[PDB]
C-alpha cells in the first residue's frame, strides 16, 4: 500500500487495524511508532508496498523522505535515502518521491526505497531535465486571481471587500499587516476557501508558524489544500527548517510550470525564529536583531515571482504591529516596501466590530493596471475617490451597507454609478 493511505487514518482506525491483525501492544505509542510497527510487520509479511514523501538532504548528503501529513515532524517513519540515488538521479530538496520501498535492513532504523517510478508528478526521465527556479526570469503579475466566490454567502462579502480593496495576482508577493485581535485568521480562512472554490487547479499551501493548536486543528478541517503548521511548543529550529522545506517544495512545484500559492502566518514570527536560530554576526541592530537574521526571511518572502514560460509562486504573509514589542516594529519597517500587495488592518475598525477590519484608504496594490481590464480600473478609481476623504470607520460602514444589499461586484459598480 501507500504510506499516506494508512498515515492519514485516525488513531481509532489504526488501533483497530493493529489489533485485528494481531500485533501485541498498540496503545501507548505515537502516530509514528504505530505506523512504523505496522509497516515493519507488513514488510516481513512479504507483500509489495509503496511509499510517499518529500526529500531532504542533510549536511552530509544523507537523504530523508518526510511526509506533509504529519506536519513534517522528524521521525523513523521518514524514508531512507542513500547518497547513491541522490547522486544518480540528481535529486534535491523539495522533490516528491514515490515508488518501490524496502524494509529496513538489520541495523537500520529507516525504511528504504527499492526504486523510484514517479517524481514531481512526472515520469523520472522527464523530471531530470528541468530548469532551476533561480535560473528563471521574474515578471510582474498579470493573471488576475479573483476572490469573489459569487455564491452569495455571509462570509463571501468579506472576500468581496478584498476584491474592492487590493487586487490579487498570480505570482504576486504581498503583505497583510494587522495588530492583534483584528481578524487575521478569519481573513486567511476566507482566502483559502476562495482559492479552493474558484481556482481548484492552482496548488494551495498554508503555513502557520508557532500558532496555538486549536486554530491549527481548525485549519486541517477547513482548508481543502494541505496545511503545514507547527505549534509554539516546537523550537525555533524546527520552525525555520519547516519553512525552508515548504518554500523548497513550492519552488520545485513551480519548476514544473505549476501555480503555487502560499499563505503565511506570520512572517514576523518566522523572522523572530530565524533571529533566535541564526548565530550573532557581531552587528546587533535595534530591537536585538542580528543584521544577517532577517536575510533568510527576505529570501523566503522574495522567492515569489512570475515566470516567462509558465508557472508562478504567490506568497501572502501576515506581519504583526502594535504588539507592544518594538522589535516587531523593526521587522515590519524592514519589510515595509518589499511586497507588491499591501493590505492594512487596524484595531479601531475592529473595536466597532465591523468586519472585515480593513483600512481602505491606506491599503492598495501597485502595478495593478496589468492585472485587470481598464473599465473596472475606472470603476474602482471612482469608488476610491468618493470614499477617500471620509473616515475609515464610516468607510467600512458605508461599504458593507452598500455591498450587502447587492449581489456581485459588477452589481455594486452599476448601483454606485447609477446613483
Amino acid at each position: 500500500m501507500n504510506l499516506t493511505e494508512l498515515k492519514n487514518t485516525p488513531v481509532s482506525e489504526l488501533i483497530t487495524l493493529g489489533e485485528n491483525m494481531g500485533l501485541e501492544n498498540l496503545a501507548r505509542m505515537r502516530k509514528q511508532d504505530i505506523i512504523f510497527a505496522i509497516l515493519k510487520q507488513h514488510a516481513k509479511s512479504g507483500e509489495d508496498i509503496f511509499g510517499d514523501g518529500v526529500l531532504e538532504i542533510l549536511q552530509d548528503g544523507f537523504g530523508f523522505l518526510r511526509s506533509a501529513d504529519s506536519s513534517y515532524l522528524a521521525g523513523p517513519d521518514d524514508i531512507y535515502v542513500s547518497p547513491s540515488q541522490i547522486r544518480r538521479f540528481n535529486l534535491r530538496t523539495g522533490d516528491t518521491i514515490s515508488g518501490k520501498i524496502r524494509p529496513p535492513k538489520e541495523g537500520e532504523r529507516y525504511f528504504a526505497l527499492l526504486k523510484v517510478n514517479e517524481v514531481n508528478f512526472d515520469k523520472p526521465e522527464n523530471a531530470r531535465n528541468k530548469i532551476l527556479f533561480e535560473n528563471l526570469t521574474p515578471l510582474h503579475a498579470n493573471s488576475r486571481l479573483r476572490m469573489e466566490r459569487g455564491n452569495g454567502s455571509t462570509e463571501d462579502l468579506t472576500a468581496r471587500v478584498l476584491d474592492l480593496a487590493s487586487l490579487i495576482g498570480r505570482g504576486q508577493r504581498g503583505l497583510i499587516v494587522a495588530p492583534p485581535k483584528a481578524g487575521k485568521t478569519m481573513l486567511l480562512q476566507n482566502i483559502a476557501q476562495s482559492i479552493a472554490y474558484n481556482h481548484p487547479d492552482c496548488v494551495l499551501m498554508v503555513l502557520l508558524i508557532d500558532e496555538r493548536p486549536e486554530e491549527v486543528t481548525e485549519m486541517q478541517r477547513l482548508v481543502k489544500g494541505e496545511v503545514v503548521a507547527s505549534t509554539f511548543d516546537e523550537p525555533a529550529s524546527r520552525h525555520v527548517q519547516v519553512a525552508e522545506m515548504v518554500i523548497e517544495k513550492a519552488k520545485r512545484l513551480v519548476e514544473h510550470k505549476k501555480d503555487v500559492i502560499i499563505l503565511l502566518d506570520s512572517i514576523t514570527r518566522l523572522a523572530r525564529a530565524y533571529n533566535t536560530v541564526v548565530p550573532a554576526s557581531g552587528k546587533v541592530l535595534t530591537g536585538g536583531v542580528d543584521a544577517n537574521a532577517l536575510h533568510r526571511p527576505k529570501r523566503f518572502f522574495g522567492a515569489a515571482r512570475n515566470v516567462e514560460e509558465g508557472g508562478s509562486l504567490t506568497i501572502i504573509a501576515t506581519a504583526l504591529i502594535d504588539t507592544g514589542s518594538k522589535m516587531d516594529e523593526v521587522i515590519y519597517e524592514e519589510f515595509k516596501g518589499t511586497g507588491n500587495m499591501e493590505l492594512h488592518l487596524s484595531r479601531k475598525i475592529a473595536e466597532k466590530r465591523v468586519f472585515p477590519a480593513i483600512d481602505y484608504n491606506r491599503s492598495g496594490t501597485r502595478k495593478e493596471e496589468l492585472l485587470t481590464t481598464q473599465e473596472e480600473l475606472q470603476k474602482m478609481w471612482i469608488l476610491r475617490k468618493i470614499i477617500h476623504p471620509m473616515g475609515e470607520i464610516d468607510a467600512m460602514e458605508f461599504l458593507i451597507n452598500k455591498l450587502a444589499m447587492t449581489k456581485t461586484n459588477d452589481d455594486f459598480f452599476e448601483m454606485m454609478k447609477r446613483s
Binding site: 498579470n142 479573483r146 516567462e308 485587470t372 481598464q374
Partner: protein, 187 residues
C-alpha cells in the same frame, strides 16, 4: 510611384484591420460560449475579458490607421490630378483671376495673403455654383480604377470602431498589454 505606394499600403491596412476584426469576433464568440457553459473557468473568464479588451483596442487602432492611409492616398490623388489639370489650364485660370494673382506676384506678405484669400473664396462661389446646378462627376481613368478599388469613403465599420478615443496613459498601457499578449501567443 508614390500613388502606388499609397494604394498598396492602404490595401495592407484594410487587410490588417479586417484580420483584427476577425480575431476580435472570434474571441468574443468564444468568451460568450464559455459564459453559456456552466463550468466556472473564472481565471479563464478574466483572461478572456483582458483579451477582448486589448483586441478591441487593437481593432480601433487599426481602423484609425486605415482611415489615415485612405485620407493620405486620396490627398495624393487630388494633388496629382489637380496639379496636371491646373498645368493644362493655368493660363486661362490666371486670366480669370488676373488682379489678385499678379498682386501676389509682387506685393507685401499681408497683401499677398489677402490676394490668396480672395482667389480662394472666388473659387468658393465658383465651385458652389457648379455643384448647385449639379452635374454628375467622374474620376480620371487610372485614378478611377484605383479609387473604385479603394472606394469613395472608408467603410462604416472602419468609422464606428474609431469614434471612441483613448487617453495616452491607456495608449501605452494597452501597448504593453498587447506586447504581453504577443509573448503569451509565442508561448
Amino acid at each position: 510611384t508614390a500613388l502606388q505606394q499609397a494604394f498598396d499600403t492602404c490595401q495592407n491596412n484594410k487587410a490588417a484591420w479586417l484580420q483584427r476584426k476577425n480575431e476580435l469576433a472570434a474571441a468574443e464568440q468564444e468568451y460568450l460560449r464559455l459564459l453559456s457553459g456552466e463550468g466556472r473557468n473564472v481565471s479563464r473568464l478574466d483572461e478572456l475579458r483582458n483579451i477582448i479588451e486589448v483586441r478591441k483596442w487593437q481593432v480601433n487602432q487599426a481602423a484609425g490607421r486605415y482611415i489615415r492611409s485612405h485620407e493620405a492616398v486620396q490627398h495624393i490623388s487630388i494633388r496629382d490630378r489637380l496639379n496636371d489639370f491646373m498645368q493644362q489650364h493655368g493660363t486661362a485660370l490666371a486670366a480669370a483671376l488676373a488682379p489678385e494673382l499678379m498682386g501676389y506676384s509682387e506685393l507685401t506678405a499681408i497683401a499677398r495673403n489677402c490676394a490668396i484669400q480672395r482667389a480662394t473664396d472666388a473659387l468658393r462661389e465658383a465651385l458652389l455654383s457648379w455643384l448647385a446646378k449639379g452635374e454628375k462627376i467622374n474620376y480620371s481613368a487610372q485614378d478611377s480604377d484605383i479609387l473604385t478599388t479603394i472606394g469613395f469613403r472608408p467603410d462604416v465599420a472602419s468609422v464606428d470602431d474609431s469614434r471612441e478615443k483613448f487617453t495616452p496613459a491607456q495608449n501605452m498601457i494597452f501597448s504593453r498589454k498587447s506586447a504581453q499578449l504577443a509573448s503569451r501567443q509565442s508561448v
